[PDB]
């Protein structure tokens, strides 16, 4: 019957974990998008190479 201790615990000095967690989010998304554009750029590379040998 001490959940209050945990709640107020995770409420004290939230700025740090808040900033680190947000930066973590921005970096996770930046990563995902980078992987996507790498995929697309690779597809374009394959396309250009095929076009470059078929004509």
């Amino acid at each position: 019957r001490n959940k209050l201790a945990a709640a107020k615990c995770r409420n004290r000095r939230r700025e740090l974990t808040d900033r680190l967690q947000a930066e973590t989010d921005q970096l996770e998304e930046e990563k995902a998008e980078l992987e996507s554009e790498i995929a697309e750029l690779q597809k374009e590379k394959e396309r250009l190479e095929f076009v470059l040998v078929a004509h």
């Binding site: 995770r10 973590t24 930046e30 980078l34 790498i38 750029l41 690779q42 590379k45 076009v51 004509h55």
Partner: protein, 67 residues
């Protein structure tokens, strides 16, 4: 002994506080490590992307050169 029980409560509180600090510092440590790893990964990916762009630019250039 109405007071000793309050000293016990005091000790319990100080323990809870201590545990809180330990958990918080551990979480901050994990997060910092995470942000570091992600930053390294995003740097490598960003490099890969850049290089791929360069390659695509050259291929496109050559393709146009043969039109």
């Amino acid at each position: 002994q109405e007071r000793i029980k309050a000293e016990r409560k005091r000790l319990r509180n100080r323990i809870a506080a201590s545990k809180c600090r330990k958990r918080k510092l551990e979480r901050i440590s994990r997060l910092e490590e995470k942000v570091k790893t992600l930053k390294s990964q995003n740097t490598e990916l960003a490099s890969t992307a850049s290089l791929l762009r360069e390659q695509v630019a050259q291929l496109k250039q050559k393709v146009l050169s043969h039109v």
